[model samples]
Target: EHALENYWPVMGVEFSEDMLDFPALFGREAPVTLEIGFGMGASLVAMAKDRPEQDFLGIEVHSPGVGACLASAHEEGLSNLRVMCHDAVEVLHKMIPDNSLRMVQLFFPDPWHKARHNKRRIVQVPFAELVKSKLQLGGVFHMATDWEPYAEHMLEVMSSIDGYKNLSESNDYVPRPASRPVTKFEQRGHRLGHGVWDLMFERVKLEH
Candidate 1:
């Protein structure tokens, strides 16, 4: 199953099964936080520079996105950062080991708002199951979306997963945490009157 090539941005290096626990793969012993679809990577770099104690993996399919992330990581001298070029599903299936991840972030993912494209949306039952498979007990999964229908769908689907429990009680949005970077994209979204929806949940136990 680990047949991916070492070359990046097209395919990724075949990750060793124990790479999550192996320092050689990531460079240090620290809690690993992954950001899925970090566009242009400004936010990823901002967070990595601000938080040096945590290691990060940013997964994106866009070449420019990967390049921007790596370039910023270099510019900031962020020793704790790593880049993954393949899709998140591959990372979940091959790279991350069970019970090894600390936190996973999904920010403003493509909502595929058109009813016909709903299947392409990332926040779904099976995808959550895959994410849950990689989360350690008590590990957190954080997601944000600007599309109302998709946000509601995310809540309904994720809430039904047996291994996860909602960390919030209401449907209202919460303020972004201090660690999150203030970016132009978010500013534009705000200016457009886009409502942001955030969901935070934790993996509780493995599904039987």
Candidate 2:
């Protein structure tokens, strides 16, 4: 429904091996936050608007999602947000410079909750390490999931990574943050009586 073809030229970020220079990309250097799989971009757009000075780059592979996100961001006149249609791993490694991000947000991934396939989940040891390398010291890797099992899986994976400190006072899930807006999907999940978990891990290691 969105005229994404037109919006793409203005708001779309193309993938390249070249590390993005934030100041040039945003016209001013600001803390950069990347959101992975920003479905329809409701939360991402709202957060971008809420924090007008913070730079937000969202990656989603689905074209319809990209279109909707682009339309919404354009409609909101969000100068601090850019939408990209690509696999997040490539964008994280190539477009984003090492030790550059302030935070990387991953929310509501596939509920591939089968214990047998725990090894298959994308948030594995190596991926977490890669994410850590991309973040500056003290940067946060924030994640949220509605499925309890998946949340457990995420906690186990992050716990295995040595350099991250869990932000949860309970040493487990943290309370949902106001910075993360409730999406339509999450609201629906709430109505269905599903629980949501938020996990935050801060990079405490300065060395590579």
Candidate 3:
């Protein structure tokens, strides 16, 4: 079983395993970030290497992607990064504790380009609210996509949410941060004139 083979050293706790006890898992009370559908995990690995003070949990369904990420984490000798093979929605709802995450990353998710299939896209209102509910006060929901329609859709869904504030001054897409790694696919897309749009919505700290 691939899940059991690498579960200890590289791939972190599978959701089917321990319930997430963040402090015990990472050996500290560091800020935790969650990235959904981290395809191939190059960017996630880079971020973990870059920010050792924070802990990162990446969820992906593809077994090879999980192994690839695990290999990279092991290669870098990083203890701060973990990977889980599971559905993001289920993981968020069932495993991750409330107000426990510092940031949630969604990058270049399947756009479901057909109008009839748009409902399959993951960045919908209920999902957004779930992510918001999982975030600590002042935590962020950050997303990026090269699809223009999807970008606008994300903006509309995120902006209309009551508990989040867009981090950019113009209340629209912002420039992609250098911190987000430019993957090989992204580079090829850029060479062909594709644009990437980034959105960051911070969870508002409600007054008591």
The top-ranked prediction according to TM-score is 2
Give the clashing pairs for model 3: none
After superposition, which runs of candidate 3 have C-alpha atoms over 4 Å from their true positions? 1-10, 17-19, 184-194, 206-208
Ten residues in a row with the worst lDDT in model 2?
185-194
lDDT of 1 by residue, 80-194 (tens): 7777767678678877878778888898899897999989998888888888887889988888886789888988898788878787866444456655555443553566554
Q: Would you list the rank order by TM-score, best first?
A: 2, 3, 1
Taking the tens digit of each residue's C-alpha lDDT, what string does model 2 give over 17-128? Answer: 8888888888897999999988889889899999998999899998899898888988899999888898888887788888899999998877777777767667877888
Model 3 weakest 10-residue run by lDDT? 1-10
Candidate 3 residue-wise lDDT, 56-161, digit = tens:
9999988788877777777788889888888989998888999999999999899999999999999999999999999999999999997889999999999888
Instruction: State the displacement of the C-alpha of residue 89, model 1, in Å, after optimal TM-score superposition.
Output: 0.5
In candidate 2 the C-alpha lDDT for residue 20 amounts to 86
The lDDT of each candidate is 0.74, 0.85, 0.85
- What is candidate 3's CA lDDT for residue 50? 94
Every model's TM-score: 0.83, 0.91, 0.89
Clashing pairs in 2: none
By lDDT: ranked, best first: 2, 3, 1
